[PDB]
C-alpha cells in the first residue's frame with residue numbers, strides 16, 4: 001500500500017529521474033532488464049510503492065515522463081536503465097517549448113495535458129491505496145515551469161487530499177542559464193504556493209561548491225551532480241520502503257514541517273560526504289553526522305541559514321544507531337544555537353530513524369530544513385523581475401501567447417506577500 | 430581527557446612540528462600510515478590527548494598547520510609522516526608573508542584567520558575536556574610573528590581559562606638571520622606578555638654549541654637541531670600521557686613557575702646528552718643527570734644564569750629512580766648556589782617524576798628554568814630596536830600597511846617596563 | 859632630508875551592499891598601493907565576493923549615508939565607512955550597527 005506515482009517534466013526533470021530510477025533499482029536490487037537479483041526478502045517486502053509486478057515476475061517503474069520535444073526522451077530510452085520503463089508512459093509533443101512559460105502553459109500545454117491526464121488516471125486506478133504524487137521539474141525552463149505547473153493545477157482539482165511535493169530546481173543567483181528566468185520563476189511560484197503541500201528548492205550553485213570544496217571532484221559532470229539530488233529524494237521516502245525503529249512518511253513531514261499553509265518551501269541536505277582519499281581520516285559517528293548537516297556549506301540552496309531563523313527541522317537517519325545518541329545531539333545543537341532557531345516553537349526538530357543504510361555505506365542521514373533564510377532567494381527573483389518589467393522588455397513573447405500585463409502584476413504582488421510573511425515570523429515574540 | 434590541540438605557524442614552526450610528531454609517534458608506537466604497532470597497553474591508555482581515533486582503528490594527530498604560502502606545506506606532506514595528518518587542517522594562503530610583521534597581522538592575517546578559527550573551533554568541540562593549546566612559531570619571521578600572535582589574541586578572547594603556551598624561537602644575538610628582526614621581535618613580545626600563560630624561549634645560537642661542544646656533531650643539520658627541541662616539548666607533557674609516582678601537567682607548571690602575571694618567559698634544558706663514543710665513559714645516576722641540568726653550557730637560551738637569579742625551577746624526570754636520591758640533590762644544589770637563587774622564595778624547585786623513559790634510554794630529565802638572566806636578552810632586542818628606530822629606517826614597509834609610529838612607541842615602552850621588573854625582583858629583600 | 863613625507867595608509871571600512879551580517883574589512887588604502895582609482899576596484903573584487911553577493915562585481919562606491927558617489931581616492935577620509943555596491947540603486951539598512 002501507500003503507492004507513489006512519480007512524474008517528470010522538462011529537460012532537467014527527466015535527467016534527474018534518469019539517474020534517480022537507477023538509484024532506486026540499486027536499493028531493491030533490480031537489473032536493467034526488470035527482473036530481480038537481490039539477496040534479502042526486505043527488498044521485495046515494500047516493492048509495490050515504486051513498482052508494478054508485470055507478468056513474468058518483472059517490475060516496471062510507476063513513472064510518467066512528459067516533454068514537448070522528443071530530443072530528451074530519445075536520450076532516456078537509449079541509455080542504460082531505459083529499457084525498464086513502459087513505452088506507453090513516454091508522452092511527448094512535437095513543437096517544443098522554446099524556453100517560454102506561456103507556450104508551456106497555454107499553447108502546447110493545452111494540446112498535451114489531456115493525453116497526460118489519461119495516463120495519470122490509469123496509474124491512479126492501478127494503485128491500491130494512493131499515498132501521493134511526487135514531481136521533478138525546474139523553474140528556469142519553459143517545459144517544467146509551464147507544463148509542470150499546469151499538471152499540478154489539474155491534479156489538485158482531481159485529488160484535493162493526496163500529498164503533492166515537487167523537487168523543483170530554483171535558478172542560481174550569480175550565473176544565469178536563461179535570460180528570461182526571472183519571468184519563468186515568478187509565474188511559477190504563483191502556481192506553487194496555491195496547489196502544493198511542500199517543495200524542495202535546490203540551487204545549482206550550491207551543488208558546484210559541494211562537488212568542489214567537499215567531495216574534491218575535479219571534473220563534476222551532471223552524472224555526478226544529479227546523483228546527489230537522487231540520494232536526497234530516496235532519503236525522504238526511505239522509512240516508507242523499509243521498517244525502522246521510528247517511522248515517518250510523506251504525510252508526517254507535511255504535518256510537522258509546515259506550520260502555515262503557504263510557508264512550505266524547504267532546503268535539503270545530505271550527510272556524510274567524504275572525499276576519495278580523505279574518507280579514512282574521519283570516524284562515522286552520529287555527532288560526526290550531526291555537525292555536517294547544519295553548517296552552511298552543506299546546504300543545497302544558496303542561502304546562509306545564519307541570516308534567518310529555522311522554523312522546523314526534519315532529520316531522517318539511516319542505519320543502526322543508538323536513539324539516546326541521536327536525541328542528545330538534536331538537543332545539543334538547539335541549545336548552543338539558541339538565537340538561530342525560532343522562539344515560539346519549542347522542540348522544533350523531528351527525527352525519523354530507518355534501519356537499512358544506503359548501498360556501500362554503514363550509516364547516513366538527510367536534512368530537511370525550513371527557514372526564513374529563503375526570503376533572500378525570493379528577494380532576488382522579485383528584484384530581477386521588476387528590473388526587467390519596468391522597461392517591459394521580453395514581454396511581447398508572452399503577450400502574443402494571449403496574456404495581459406494584469407497577469408504579471410498579480411503574480412508579482414503574490415510574491416511580495418510571501419516576502420512579508422517570512423519577514424513577519426522572523427521577528428515574532 | 431585533558432586533550433591538547435597543537436597549532437603550528439611559520440616556516441620554522443612547521444619544521445619543528447614535522448620532527449615533533451615523528452617523536453610522539455615513536456613513543457606511542459605509530460607507523461607513518463596511522464595504525465598501531467606497539468607492544469604495551471600503556472601506549473594506548475592516554476592516546477586521546479594528541480590523537481583522535483578515526484574509523485578503522487587509525488589515529489590522526491590533532492594538529493592545525495598555518496602558513497601564507499604553500500612552499501612549506503608541500504614539504505611536510507611530501508616527507509615521511511606526512512600522510513598521517515588530515516588534509517583538512519592544511520590551511521594556507523597564496524600571497525606569502527614576505528618577512529613582514531604588519532603583513533602577517535593586518536593584510537594577510539585578516540584574510541586567513543576566519544578560515545583558521547573554524548578549524549580551531551571544530552577541534553575544540555571534538556575534545557571531551559580541553560586542557561589547553563600549545564603553539565610552535567618563531568619571532569624572526571613574518572608568518573609566525575604576525576599570524577601567530579593574531580591567533581593568540583583571538584583564542585584568548587574565546588577561551589579565557591585554558592592554558593596557552595608557545596615554543597617561540599627568540600633570535601640569536603650574534604648572528605642575525607633577518608635584517609628587520611628587532612622590529613619583528615618587539616612587536617611580538619608586546620602581544621605575548623598580554624595573552625600567554627607561559628613561554629619557552631629558545632635561541633638558535635645555544636643549539637649550535639650543544640651540537641658541537643657536547644654532542645660532538647661535525648655536520649648538524651636542522652634534522653638534528655629540531656630533534657633536541659622536540660625532545661624538550663615531549664618532556665613537558667610526559668607526565669600527562671603516562672602514570673608516574675609524582676604527577677604534574679601543564680596547569681601545575683603555570684601555578685608553580687609563574688609568580689607574577691607578566692614574568693612568564695622560561696628557558697628549557699635537557700639531560701643527558703652524550704656523544705657517539707663518549708657515552709660509555711659515563712655512569713647514568715641522578716646526581717649525574719643533576720649536574721648537567723644546571724651548568725650554563727646546557728641552556729637552550731643564550732644567557733648565562735650566573736648573571737642573574739633563578740626564581741622557580743621545574744625538573745621533570747623520566748624513568749625509574751629513588752625519590753630520596755632526587756630530593757637530596759635538589760636540596761644540595763640549592764645550598765651551595767645560595768647566591769644564585771632568589772631569597773624571598775623558599776623551596777623554589779618543583780619536581781615531577783614519570784615512569785616511562787624515552788625510547789632507547791634508561792632515564793632522562795627536563796629542565797624548565799625561570800630566571801632574571803633573560804633581561805639581557807630583552808636589553809639587546811630593545812637596544813637594537815632603538816638603534817634602528819631613531820633613524821626611522823625600514824619603517825615605510827610598515828607604515829604603508831596601515832600603522833602609525835605610536836604603535837612602535839607603546840610597544841617599545843612595554844618592553845622597558847618588563848626590563849625594570851626583572852631588575853627590581855633581582856635585588857629584592 | 860631623509861625622514862620622508864609619511865607614506866601612510868588610510869584605515870577605512872567597506873561594508874558590502876545587501877549583506878546585513880557583515881562587518882567590513884579595513885584596508886590599507888594609500889596612494890602608494892594604487893596608482894589610480896581604477897586599481898582599487900580590482901582589490902575590492904576578490905576580497906568581498908566569496909559565495910553569495912555581487913554578480914556584477916564591484917562598480918559603484920557609495921557613502922554610508924549614502925547620498926554621494928565616490929570619485930577619486932582623494933575624496934576618501936580617514937576612519938569612515940563606505941558602502942560598496944554594484945548598481946545604481948542603493949539599499950538603506952543599518953550597516954554601522956554593532957561593529
Ligand SMILES: Nc1nc2c(ncn2[C@@H]2O[C@H](COP(=O)(O)OP(=O)(O)O)[C@@H](O)[C@H]2O)c(=O)[nH]1
Nearest residue numbers: 010011012015097138140141142143144177222
Ligand atoms: N541540476 C541540473 N540542472 C539541469 C540539468 N539539465 C538542465 N538543468 C537545468 O534546467 C534548466 C533549463 O530548463 P530545461 O530543463 O531545459 O527546460 P525546458 O528547456 O523548458 O525543457 C537550467 O536551469 C539548467 O541548469 C541537469 O542534468 N541537472
Ligand SMILES: Nc1nc2c(ncn2[C@@H]2O[C@H](COP(=O)(O)OP(=O)(O)O)[C@@H](O)[C@H]2O)c(=O)[nH]1
Nearest residue numbers: 439440441444526567569570571572573606651
Ligand atoms: N631552529 C630552527 N629555526 C628555524 C628553522 N627554520 C627556520 N628557522 C628560523 O626561523 C626564522 C625565520 O622565520 P620563518 O619561519 O621563515 O617565518 P616566515 O618567513 O615569516 O614564514 C629564523 O630565525 C630561522 O633561523 C628550523 O628548522 N629550525
